[PDB]
Structures are given as structure tokens and as C-alpha cells.
RNA sequence: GGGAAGCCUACCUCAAGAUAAGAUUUCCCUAGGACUUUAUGUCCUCUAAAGAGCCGUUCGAGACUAGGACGUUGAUAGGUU
RNA sequence: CCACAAGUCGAGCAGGUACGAAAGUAGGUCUUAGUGAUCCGGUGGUUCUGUAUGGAAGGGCCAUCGCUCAACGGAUAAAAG
RNA sequence: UAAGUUCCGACCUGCACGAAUGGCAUAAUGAUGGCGGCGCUGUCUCCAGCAGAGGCUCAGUGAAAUCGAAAUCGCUGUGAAGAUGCAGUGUACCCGCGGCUAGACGGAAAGACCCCGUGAACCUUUACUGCAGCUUGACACUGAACUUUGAGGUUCUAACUCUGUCCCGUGAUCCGGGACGAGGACCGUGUCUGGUGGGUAGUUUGACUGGGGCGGUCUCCUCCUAAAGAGUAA
RNA sequence: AUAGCACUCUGCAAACACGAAAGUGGACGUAUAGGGUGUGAUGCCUGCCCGGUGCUGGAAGGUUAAUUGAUGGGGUUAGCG
RNA sequence: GCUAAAACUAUGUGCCGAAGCUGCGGAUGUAUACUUUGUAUACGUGGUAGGGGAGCGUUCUGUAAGCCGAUGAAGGUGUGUUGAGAAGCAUGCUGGAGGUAUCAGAAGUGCGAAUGCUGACGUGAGUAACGACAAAACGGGUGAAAAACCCGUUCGCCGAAAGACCAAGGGUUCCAGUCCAACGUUAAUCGGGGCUGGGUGAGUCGACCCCUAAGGCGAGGCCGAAAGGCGUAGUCGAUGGGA
RNA sequence: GAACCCACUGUCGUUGAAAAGCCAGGGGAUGACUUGUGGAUAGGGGUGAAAGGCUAAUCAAGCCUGGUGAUAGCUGGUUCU
RNA sequence: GUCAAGUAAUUAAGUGCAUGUGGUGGAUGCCUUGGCAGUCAGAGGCGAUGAAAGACGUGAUAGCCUGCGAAAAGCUCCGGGGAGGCGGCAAAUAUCCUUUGAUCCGGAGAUGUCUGAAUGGGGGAACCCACCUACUUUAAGGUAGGUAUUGCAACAUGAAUACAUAGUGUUGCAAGGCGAACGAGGGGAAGUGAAACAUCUCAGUACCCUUAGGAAAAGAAAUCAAUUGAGAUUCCCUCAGUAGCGGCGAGCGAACGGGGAUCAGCCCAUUAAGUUAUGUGUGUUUUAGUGGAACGCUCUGGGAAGUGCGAACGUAGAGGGUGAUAUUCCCGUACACGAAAGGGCACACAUAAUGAUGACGAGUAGGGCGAGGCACGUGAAACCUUGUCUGAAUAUGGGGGGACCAUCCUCCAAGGCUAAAUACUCCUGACUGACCGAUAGUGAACCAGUACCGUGAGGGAAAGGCGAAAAGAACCCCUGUGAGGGGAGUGAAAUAGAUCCUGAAACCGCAUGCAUACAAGCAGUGGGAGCACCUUCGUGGUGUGACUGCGUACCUUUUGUAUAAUGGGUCAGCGACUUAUAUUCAGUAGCGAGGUUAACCGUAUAGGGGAGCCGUAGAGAAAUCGAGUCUUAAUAGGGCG
């Protein structure tokens, strides 16, 4: 019962090389280099699925800060005022409104400073 | 493997990986790492276990209606057509025939038929009892198998 | 306020790839159609400037280059006197 | 107490003793170091075994003897550069 | 010599010369070691010019070691402790050609120095244990006749020796047979046995250890280290 | 290495060497010869030590092998109890 | 970059901040109760050396005289799609004759490393080098093409060898015609290259032959477990003697 | 002092023209000389004017084939979920 | 309109990624006049009448292979067979042969150069040189025969030396050499293990030497046993890893008894069983061969054996081939026949010859000394062999029963022959495989022990595939009458076009789209504008990726590695926990106080075979006892149960 490895081995190598498409030089041509490149790409993706949430929260916070300072408040004071006013709109929606609807954001800031007062 | 007695090159200084023989199993054309030898594949089967398995097989055939009993099963002449018509009458065109003794005419008539074989009552085996579609057994052969108790 | 062969200048050379890409003088190019992707728009016809280079004769310039001079409206090289 | 192999303390029961009038005390010395496994042999004893049988030789069991095996859990009976 | 750790001569507290593992000298000899002088010079101050052969360019043929992959800068710091690749910062448009060797702990050879492995080989000896060789005695081959106080002495021939002479096989410095001569129970050989035996052979020659070696230590008892139960390392 | 020097062994079937032996070299030589060892032309020379190891020659006291097998001690049994 | 701080000390109110906690969706292990269930609840699910459990694919045997296949198998190359994974499924193109469900059974059953083995191909790089510094120039010829071939006219080098012979060694390399892929460190019309055909004439040259040296073998023979060692008579053996 | 036989110095060469050379100098060159042909000595053996030199580019024990897949408490490697 | 300030678009020397289309290369898949392992039955040799192995020749053309040998791809005879043939690479060509029977197949004859045991002498194998007879020739030759050594026999001759013997010669007969494994005998290691090493082990193994047969060896008790029983050798299963041996270490390791396979005894001088030759007869087997059933239509297709519809044979549905997959197309298969001539075996007679120089076993048994063999290493060491020295009794006798003695039991050494059961495979025929399918399987599928390397012994490769059929591309064009290509033609297919099935990867080109010449690092990852093509016109698909957060490969080894510590230039293919036996534990199945057979027989996975093994009882060193037993004076106590 002699077994020849060629078909299965070729299939595995071809799948790895297919996943390595678009990489530079030997990273998309040579099996050893390509295999090292695919594993590292997976590791990076696993880490960056966590990093993405932090990055987008930072972006929302920056935009909310800009809007609040246009309306005469700091970000921390506006967040505190909304908390005291019981508004539970999250930072994603707050930043969206800050970017796309200045009048509504002005109303929100007015509510926050009214609760602060 | 032929040859391979001498050390291919010296242990140190050449820059090659160290080697002891050209017929090393790592080398192309070298020996097989674990060379096979002729093997004996027979197993022991307990006497009672064999008999019980045959009894179970016969009972299962009976309750699945693949065993057909006949008072007598003989052919006048060694004619394949004669045997074929006889089996087509019983609707057992694919069958194993079991008789108390194997008549020469019956054996000759059955030799050329596909899916038909004829055996003595003392020569039944578990694989052949299962492989064929039906088992046509004479009453004398059934009595002999009863005495043997499978 | 004074105060050293030391620092910045001052002297010589390089220097706008200084992408912040600087300044001054002088010179050159001033035509028609079609169409839609209506615009430094895409295709046809016409036009080919001021200059630069290829090539050649060469150099007190030179590894190859680069740089300098000249090409009949001529002394650039060889020869001749 | 302890990996093992080992090591330590011990009331009490029976027999035979010594000293005490007696209740009693005594299974070495106030205690903790003074040591060496296994193999192979020697000596005393033995209601064990005993290669046909009776003996015997040899073996077993109980007590005991032969190590600076001190590199002291001891690779050989026997070994330097 | 201007200047002499070298050289020559002399001195002698010769660490640690010395008479055939020769002592002290010695003409000639030496591609032999050390020191000095004349001449001579690009050896040098200190390099210049020129000639040939490469280098460079063109046409033809066409290697090498190396190589995880590269979009392959400096500095200071950090860090498997000396960074192109990490941090901060400075500088930097893209790509060749001729040169250069400061770094890529550059290439080359599983470090030869050092240590370790109950590794190897060869050599030595008053290491251990065998054997060859040499040597001793007993028994066998191995006999006879006369003397003396188990042993000794004299004589003999017939076993045995001759790498002595003659004869024959035989055209023969081998060998065999025969006849002599000189020896002779010796020598020599077999078995057993004591001695000698680096000639030869197989092996051994401990561990801990602020590397290894040298030194010290290796088992048992007491105190401290030992952190108020036990135990606890150098 | 060498010529020269010295010590020592070797009486011939030589010592010595090769070989298991037969045999061969030494040598178709014979101590003015042959082997081993050291020193190294030549000139002047070459001192003291025999305790150690070795070699050579004595001595027949002590010790010692194979071989030999005098004595003593056991095993067994005819017999006697 | 910072000086009634963006430094230090004390106090207060907010906020940022992790894969920690919460929210939403999904998977999996253990246990309690549902007294089959595959269901709810509670608690768990970082891992080297190791231990335990469950699977995917590959080759072969039976099932299989079955099922799929020239209306196109295996293999190759794309695309789409499915699962937690090893992987599965469908189909376009290529290809041209085999493949094989299910359930069992057996293993030459899975590769990136071992200075691993075999073949192919890269980088260095069109880089170093083209093998004695005795030296070349021109006209004509042939030819697809001439620095190298042929003819001619000049120049230069060796001349105790870079000339002429013999032995040893080699074996057709000798001569003629024809060809230029490979071989020739470049081209080649040329060649010691390919192909085809020729060429070596002995009484006197050499060998053979007669003779022997060193040495070898050796009838009988001597010796040795065997194989064998030595050696007599002889018989070979030139590097020497013989028209 | 040529041929011939050697190998003292230096530059070059070191993926060489060459797995030991070229060039310029150097030593012996009638003798213990150089050299052709054919023989003898074979591996714990041979041979050595002696360096552990040489014995087919190999020598503190040649080469080849077998024991043999020697052993390695050492280093490396060990393949799907 | 000029000027100023601000800010878009526009380059690719080259490069990256994606896609398309190629080259190189030869993986993969499919395949096989090749290997590997067996079963059954044979056979077990060839050679002086010249072997194995070679050299050289031999053809109409003739290089290699095959065959053959100056009679040379063949000659003669007998038998078969019946239309083609002149061997293969390897086509064409010519001369030809053949129904007056060729080629081809089987049997028997003829010829059969040179070397090689090589044998007339020699020698560097395939060469040089001879002698003697008989016939033949006249010139310088031819034909045929003989000429080695050793051993034995006969005859003749014949020294020292008288008789003799040694020696010498002739004739006749025989032997030598080669080759697989198995057998018998003569010698005989070390690596290794003992965690070192010397006894020991490895191991009487490897290797060297001598010599048989189809087998060899052994064999008919001076043997075991221990109720007085068995009854010659050989092989297998148990007994049993037991009893023992052993630096009592590492290890080595029986026997008795039982179960099987096969069975067989016969003689020592008038002499047996048996064996070997030759001849005859009978039977069987083998070497060529002959006959041998039964299919059509239709669809797809280059081609049908494949689809659809019906039919026929079967003592034949084993296998192979034919343009894809055939019981009925071909070769075959089952079955029925067949032999001039030769060979093998079996049985029966005939004659030889052997057995068979030997008639009951003396330098023998036993002993002293040194060794060797027995599972047994000097041990309490019996028994066997003998190098050395000795040495009986002889049936009222002698050997053995594991030191030795007594008693009992048992056998008769110093003389022989003997089949089967057992061991093996160079070779022949048939059949088989959960064996390989060109890096595998033999080193070798192919002109392989070749090319090549080495003085030599010796070492030792790589290399398979057009197509069903060559139908292997007439002719035209470019080019040097080259190579190569474009048309044409053949073919189902030419991107099947000659190193030609398929045709992967590394590596190297061309084309299109986007990005890229002010910006510093494992080259990705999470975001994300623009552009191009497509488009279900989108909250879509494909390609690219300006700008931006984070981010120092993999393996190994380590306390710890981006480490400037190891390994890898890349791809493709290969490459490492196996096999046998024993034992223990766990799952699972059968049976259950029981479970189970081994060798072996068996037309054979069945059925027989109960010897043996495990469990069912412990204690003790043991004798012994036994639900108890050991220790003790103890019924106490205590240990194992
Ligand atoms: C021994 N081996 C012979 C040897 O060597 N002799 C030498 C030789 O002949 C030679 O010496 C050289 N030439 O070196 C000679 C000088 O002319 O001297 C002699 N010797 C002498 N010694 C002697 C001495 O002193 N006096 C007298 C006279 O007898 C001298 N000669
Ligand atoms: C065995 N035991 C005693 C025995 O019965 N026969 C053999 C006797 C041999 C014994 N060594 C005495 C002897 O004669 N030795 C010689 C010797 O070694 C040698 O001759 C020379 N000259 O040196 C050799 C040359 O070949 O020949 C041998 N003799 C030969 N006779 C043989 C023969 O004929 N065939 C085969 C081969 O054995 C030949 N060799
Ligand atoms: N539109 C474009 C048009 C362009 C224009 N037209 C130009 C043009 O078109 N130029 C064409 C150039 C093509 C090329 N240059 C020519 C070429 O190559 N000639 C080759 C000429 C000689 C050729 N070497 C010989 C040959 O083949 N020997 C083989 C060989 O011994 C061996 O084979 C292998 N493998 O080992 C053997 C095994 O079978 O078979 C042989 N042969 C066999 N054949 C047989 C067969 O089939 N059956 C039966 C049997 O006889 C078979 N054996």
C-alpha cells in the first residue's frame, strides 16, 4: 500500500500561495516565505480586530470635543452634563450628529449645560 | 541493497552533511527504512464463537426470508439451461445451493452460472452465506446442519 | 562698560533637489474640422519655431562620461611653407 | 523517623535469675559518635533436604567469625604515566 | 659609536660547565649563527619621468564562493549586555559607472587553544594481567660393563648426531640407500614444571571544585548559620 | 653519516638476523674476521666513586616447583551387641 | 516646548484609559433538574514538557458481473459556495480513459527545516577570465559571411632546439574528397571535429629464433593442521652475446 | 664552469599556466655521482646516511571487501485537524 | 489686459501588484515484453568424447544484437503443419524460395576454428616452437593418428651388492577443472554487552581451508527409568524461562515424562538386509499438434465492444487482443482426440559387482598430569574426547544409575551396513498476490555490471510513453541547397510534428489597468480617497492603493533570542516510532467455576487432536500440614492467610 504524496501536497501548497496573493517578491511566489507571511497576517488581523474599537472610539471622542468647543463646552464637561441630564446616546451617534447636523448638536450641548447649571 | 559498504566521504572538512553509506534510507535509491517481510494474517477464532456466529447467520437468514427449503434438488443431466430453468421456477436466479452431497451433474451445471454456486452441507462458510442473495437448502442438508448445530 | 590664538563674521572654494526648487536680460511659437466624456476634453488635417542632440575635425578636458573649440560664411586636426 | 535498604523508643505476657524484710528494681553504661550492605568462605548446633534405595558428600535453617571495601550504598579477586 | 640590552677582551657567588651522553683548542671547509668596515646604491629623506603588461571602452564567448526574505541611512539610548530593521530624533528626489575597504560580530573549515564523555589511537615504565622467546628440573625417546662413598668416576656401542670422506640412483654441492670416520646415551625433541620476560598484546589510571590543574575534602557525632515545631546550602 | 678511537660478544654446524619448520643470509668468510654499542679528523688529553641497577665470576648455607607419598582423620559394611 | 507652570505641596469636581467588568449575538466542557429527549439553569474554556478524548484527507481489499464515464474519467488551471478545522460540493477551460458511494478491513498515510538525498533553475553578472609580452602589415581568391583558410609581397622569432631521428607509450590522429550543428576558451570557408574512400610491400631494419644474468617456476625431494614454504634435475626470463 | 642532478634567497602566483610552479640569483658537477630497462623486500610488516621519513596526490599503522545497520549517557531532525 | 498671491492637471529612465498569453522544466495522472514474494509438481549437476567463461570468424548489402562454426542466420532423416517466407534494431531494395509442400514447430543425427583444467614444450589467454608413425607430393608441402602429470595393475628392464631391493620404461584404466543453497569435517576473531574492564558475553558467529549427496549426518542401547517400567535414529509441540550454571554480575539455560510426523531391521569369512550397473518385459509420464458453441437492428461517435430493443450458447461467463467497456469479431477456454522417434520414473526377472580384510573385538577399559565437550566457569563434579606417562578382568567377567560405599535394577564397549519422517533452490512447468508501477520495483523495464573512476583488488550510474494506423508532412515561400519557421496536405486531434500523451512549480519574457522620482526599517495588518473596467446603476463586483494607527521573520536550543547564537539560495519528488515473539493493564465479544487447545491429521478458515496452560488455597527455607499454617517450652503473644 504505497502512498504518493504529490496531489495532496500540491493542493496544500497551492492554497497557501493563493492566500498569499498580492504580497511583494518571494512572499507571493515561494512557499516557505509565503507560509510565514500568511501566519503573520492572521496574527496581525487578530490583534487589529481589538485595536479597531479603540481607534474608532478615539475618533468619535475627538469629533465630539470639536463640536462641544464650538458650542462653548469641553468634552469632559459635556459628557458629565449629558450623564446628569440622563441622556444615554452613545459617542458614535453623538459624533455622527456633530459631523452632519450642527443644530441638533447645539441643542444637545444646550441640554448638557442646562443640566450642569 | 546492492553495494553501499564504504563511507562515501570523510567525516570532517568537506562541508557536506556527514554520511555513512550511499544506501542510507535518506538517500534516493537507498534502503527502505522498515523493510517488510512475508506475513501470516490468520487469526484464531474460538470454536464456540465460530459456531455461535454461524447459528446467528442462519437464524437471521431464516427471519429475513432468504433461506428457501426444498424436499429435493437434483438435475437429470449436466445442462446449464436445465439448472437455469429449475432456478427460475423457484425464483432464485442468484443463489447458493446447499445439498447433502454434491452431485457431479449439479456441479457441472452450476459451474458456468454467474451468481450461482453449489456446496456441500459440511462446507458452508459465513462469508458465502451472507454474500449470495438467497440460500436454497435441501431438507437433508438442513437436517445435517441441525445435527452439526451450525 | 572693558575683556582671549577660543564663538559669529571676515579670507578661499562649492552652493536653489534651498521640492521654500529664488532673481535679472534677451529670444521663440498668434491653423482649421468633427464629436461628446462640455472640459488645460477625445479624434482628423495642417504646422515643426527659438533651441538641443546625433554625426564629424579635435583639446593644455578626460577611465567611459561630462566640459571647451570648430564643421567650407572654415585655421578644428593633419600636411605644406 | 523515613525514597528504599536501614535506624529509634517501648508498657506488658511467659520461663529462669540477682539484690532487697518488703512494696519492688534489673532485657548493660545520663543520652546523643566508636562504623560496612551483598557475594564467597570458616566454626558450633540442627525432631529440614539428600538425583534408584540405605547412608554419605553437598545444600537449607539457627548462632557466630574473616574489610581504613575510609572514594566509607562498597563498578574487578586483580591496575601507573 | 655622538649615542651599543647585540659584538670583542677581561673578571668569577658556575640559580643550574667539566673530561669518549667526551673537555679545551684548532689550519682548511660551510647557500651555518652573531658583530664591524670599504665600495655601492630609489633601502631611505621623498619621490619624479618614461617603456611594456593589466586596469577603462567596443565586439564575441562566458565562471566563482555566498545567499531566510528585504522598500538594506546617521546619532543618542534600549535590549540575550557592541542595532540598517526597537525608541526618540536628525538628514535624505529616482538609477548607474570608476575607485575604496570602516561595518554587515563579512566568506572559507560542526575551534586545533580550554573543559567534558565512566570516547579513540600510538608511545613509556620498578601500573595490572596474559603470551612469544630464553632458561631449570622430572618423566619419555634411553642402552651395556667395570669402580667409589642415593650419588659420583672409568670404558664401550647398538639408539641418536654430523652444514666430514668415498660409492650408487645420476648427465645432480638437493634427497635417498650403502661403506667409512669422528662423536654418543650426551646433545636435541614431546608432556609437565619453577624462573625471567614492555619483546609483544589487552586494559586501567575517581569525584567535588566560582574553568581545569596543585592544595584540601569524601563516613559518623556536637554547636552556630537555621528566620521561637521538623527540615534547610556554600 | 663519515674516516679515526674504544668497549663488548663470536672457535665455526660461530655470534647475530629472517622463518612455523625445512632452510637462507652472516660467508663459499675464520679472531689482522664477523655482529652489537657509544664517541666523531687532528693536537693536548681523558680526574675521583662499584653504595644503587646491570654484567661477569664464586659459595653451597637458607628459601622454593612439578614428581614422590610416610603418617594422621573421615565415608561405607561383614560381623559383634 | 513649559515659570501667578504644562514644576512641587494640599484639597475638590469631571473626564480618558485594558483582550478586566457590563451589554448583544454565537460555540464548547462539567454538573443539577427536565425522570429518552436535546432541553433550561449554574459554573468553567491562556498554556511548554506531558496525559486524555474526537476527527479530516491519502493508497490498497470486500461490498462491486453494482454505480458514474467519449453527451468526456483521473490529472492540470480558474470561479462560486459550505462547515469550527483538517476539508467538502458545483461548475467554465484544458485533458483523453478510467473513476468509485456506503459500511467494514489493512497501512510504504500527511514535510520547511536534519551543513538531509536526486533533478531543474536563480543571485553574484553580462562581472573575472580567454593559458608564456617571439609581432605583425597589405593585395588578390573563395565564400552567406574572412584579423585567424589559400596564393603572393614584406616584417619578426628559434636555430645544442621552438630543427631532424629512435625506443617506450598512444592507435588511424596519416592522405584525398566533402560538411560546419556539437568539439576548438572568439569567427571559421579551417582542423588532430563529422562523413566517405584510400594508405603500411623486406633473406640483409626490428621482432620471432639460438644463448644465458638478476629473478621466477619447479618432476622427484625436504618441511608444514589444511591452504601452503623451500628447493634438486630442469625450464623460463634482456636491459647483454649470436649471418 | 655548460649539459645533467638538486632546492639556499626574493618578488609573483594562491577561484594559479601549475593540487608545489615561473623568473632572477644559488649548490654539486670522476663521484658516498646521475640515469634507462628488468627484478627482490608487503602492513604492527617492508625500507630508512634517522625527518616518524617513504610504502601509487593517502601514513603514530596503506588500500579494498566483509563482521556491519559496530557502539555513541552526545549534537541534529521528527510531516494533518 | 498686465501684475501679484494661492492652488489643481500633466513625466516613467525604470519598478511593484493583478490579469491575459508564452518560454524553460519535467511534477502529476493514466499505462507497462521489468522487478519482488510465494504455492504445487519436477530436478538437483556440467567436464579429457575437452566444461563454465571467452577470442575470432560466418550475410546479396552487414555496424551492433541473436544464431551458427571453414559443412559457419546453417547440412541429413523422421514426424507435425498448410500459404506464405529469405532472424532483430529496421524501413527500402534487389536476387529469390515455396502446394513436386517452403518459412515455422518437435525428435534424432552430421559438422563443430582458437583460448581456457588445457594435457607435445613454452608463454605476457585467444600466441611462439616441436617430435614420432602411416599414406600422399616433388620440391621446401598435405591428410589422419600419437606424444602431459599423478595413482593403480600387468609386463619388461635394472645399482651400490652376491641374491635382491631401489631406480627406469611400455601398455591399460582412473583422477584433476567449474558451479546457487543445504551437509560433514580442519582452524577460528573483534567491534559489542557487562552502563569502566581482565573471568564472562558476543560465539563456535563472521571468515579461511578440505570434501560428498540428492539429501547429508545419526542409527538398532556397555540407553534411559526408578510402582520395576520403557525399548534404534531423525524432526515438531509441550514440559519451562522450570532444575541448574554464573566477577551468584551481565547473562547462559537442560533433562525426565507426555502429545505427534515416520516407522525396519540385517550381518562378521559356506558370509545377510540393502545398494549400484547392464539387458528384457509391463505400466505411467514427458518432448510437436487437431477439432472446439452461440448476435442482429438502432442512437452517439473518427472508430462501438458503449445507449435503446430483442435473440442465441454454456461441462465453454479463465485470460488476451481488436480504433472507447465483447460469452456469441479474432486467439483462446470447458471438453474430446493425437506420436515416426527420444527421454524420466515405478514394478518384475537376468547377469554382474558391491555390502565384505571383516569371524564377539588389548596398548583397549581404567588411572596420574594438562586441556577440551557436556545448560554445568573446578565446583560436592559424575559422564564423553585425548597431548603425555602408564595400564586390567576377560562371563564365577565387565559398564552405568552425577563425589563415594553397600544393596538392587539395567546394559554387553574396544567390528560393521541400513529407507522414511528432516535441510535447501543455480534451474524447469503451471498457478497466485489487500506486492512495486520508471527518484518505486533488481544496481540494471532502455545494447548494465555497460558508460565512467581506479595500477589493482574493487566501486558503479543516468536513460520508458507520436499516432488506431506512418497516413512520419508531396508542393510553394523566407533562409547559406544550413538551422528554423509560415502556408498546403494527412489525421478525430499537429498547442499529437519527431527528446512528439498529460504538461504542475521554481525561474525568465511580452501586453493591458492602477500606483510610483521630498521620502527612512520583517514589507503586513486595521482604516481609507482617487482612478480604470464591469454593472442587476448600488448601501454592488474586479484590479490598484495616495494618506494614516499598530507592527524587529521562522525553526532549534535556552534562565532568557530581532538577536550580531544554530539551520535553510528556490521549487518539485523522496526522507524518520516499524516488524516478530513474550508479558502486563484497559476496552470489547464468547463461554463461565470453569475457560482454552499446540504440534499434527484433514481435496483443508470446517471437522478432529485434551498432551499442556491459566483459574479454583494458603502457611513454611523445607519435610510437612491445610482454612489454616509458621515461630515458641507455651492452647500465651505475634507474622502471613
Ligand atoms: C694516528 N691516528 C695517526 C695520525 O692521525 N697522525 C697524524 C697525521 O699524520 C697528521 O695530522 C694531521 N695532518 O692532521 C700529522 C701532521 O703532520 O700528525 C700526525 N700525528 C702526530 N702526532 C705526533 C706528535 O705529536 N709527535 C710526533 C709525530 O708522530 C706526530 N704526528
Ligand atoms: C592433502 N593433505 C594431501 C593430498 O592428498 N593432496 C595434495 C598434496 C599437497 C601437499 N601440500 C604436498 C604437495 O604436493 N604440495 C604442492 C605444493 O604446495 C606446490 O608445489 C610446489 N612445487 O611448490 C603446489 C603448486 O601447485 O602443488 C602442491 N601439490 C598439489 N597437488 C595438487 C593436485 O594435483 N591438484 C590440486 C592441488 O591440491 C594441487 N597441488
Ligand atoms: N505546416 C508547416 C509546414 C512546414 C514544412 N512542411 C517544413 C516541414 O514540414 N519540415 C518537417 C521536419 C520534421 C523533422 N525535422 C523530420 C524528422 O524528424 N525525420 C526523422 C527521420 C528518421 C527518424 N529519426 C527515424 C525514426 O522515427 N526512428 C524511430 C526510432 O528508431 C525508435 O523511436 C524511438 N522513439 O525510440 C523506434 C521505436 O518505435 O521507432 C522508429 N520509427 C518508427 N516509425 C514507425 C511507425 O510509426 N510504426 C512502425 C515502426 O516502423 C515504427 N518506428
From Swiss-Prot, chain B:
Q: Which GO terms describe its molecular function?
A: rRNA binding; structural constituent of ribosome
Q: Positions of the region Disordered?
A: 1-15
Q: Which GO terms describe its cellular component?
A: ribonucleoprotein complex; ribosome
Which keywords label this protein? Ribonucleoprotein, Ribosomal protein, RNA-binding, rRNA-binding
Q: Does the keyword field hold Ribonucleoprotein?
A: yes
- Write out the GO biological process terms: translation
Q: Is Membrane found in the keyword set?
A: no
Relate the assembly described in the record: Part of the 50S ribosomal subunit.
Recorded family membership: Belongs to the universal ribosomal protein uL4 family.
State the function annotated in the UniProt record.
Answer: One of the primary rRNA binding proteins, this protein initially binds near the 5'-end of the 23S rRNA. It is important during the early stages of 50S assembly. It makes multiple contacts with different domains of the 23S rRNA in the assembled 50S subunit and ribosome.
Name of the protein in its database record = Large ribosomal subunit protein uL4
Q: Which organism is it from?
A: Acinetobacter baumannii (strain AB0057)
Q: Which residues of the full protein are shown?
A: 51 to 200 of 200
Amino acid at each position: 500500500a504505497r502512498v504518493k504524496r504529490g496531489v495532496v501536497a500540491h493542493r496544500r501548497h497551492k492554497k497557501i500561495l493563493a492566500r498569499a496573493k498580492g504580497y511583494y517578491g518571494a512572499r507571493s511566489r515561494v512557499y516557505r516565505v509565503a507560509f510565514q507571511a500568511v501566519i503573520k497576517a492572521g496574527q496581525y488581523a487578530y490583534r487589529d480586530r481589538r485595536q479597531k474599537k479603540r481607534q474608532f472610539r478615539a475618533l468619535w471622542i475627538a469629533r465630539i470635543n470639536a463640536g462641544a468647543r464650538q458650542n462653548g463646552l469641553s468634552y469632559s464637561r459635556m459628557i458629565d452634563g449629558l450623564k446628569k441630564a440622563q441622556v444615554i446616546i452613545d459617542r458614535r451617534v453623538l459624533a455622527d450628529i456633530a459631523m452632519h447636523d450642527a443644530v441638533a448638536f447645539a441643542a444637545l450641548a444646550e441640554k448638557a449645560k442646562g443640566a450642569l447649571a | 541493497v546492492s553495494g553501499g559498504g564504504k563511507k562515501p566521504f570523510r567525516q570532517k572538512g568537506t562541508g557536506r552533511a556527514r554520511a555513512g553509506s550511499i544506501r542510507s534510507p535518506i538517500w534516493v535509491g537507498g534502503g527502505k527504512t522498515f523493510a517488510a517481510r512475508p506475513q501470516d494474517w490468520s487469526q484464531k477464532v474460538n470454536r464456540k464463537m465460530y459456531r455461535g456466529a454461524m447459528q446467528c447467520i442462519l437464524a437471521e437468514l431464516v427471519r429475513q426470508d432468504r433461506l428457501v427449503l426444498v424436499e429435493e434438488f437434483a438435475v437429470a443431466a449436466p445442462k446449464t439451461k436445465e439448472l437455469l430453468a429449475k432456478l427460475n421456477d423457484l425464483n432464485a436466479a442468484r443463489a447458493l445451493i446447499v445439498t447433502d452431497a454434491v452431485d457431479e451433474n449439479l456441479y457441472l451445471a452450476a459451474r458456468n452460472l454467474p451468481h450461482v454456486d453449489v456446496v456441500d452441507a459440511t462446507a458452508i462458510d459465513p462469508v458465502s452465506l451472507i454474500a449470495f442473495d438467497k440460500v436454497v437448502m435441501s431438507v437433508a442438508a438442513a437436517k445435517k446442519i441441525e445435527v452439526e448445530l451450525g
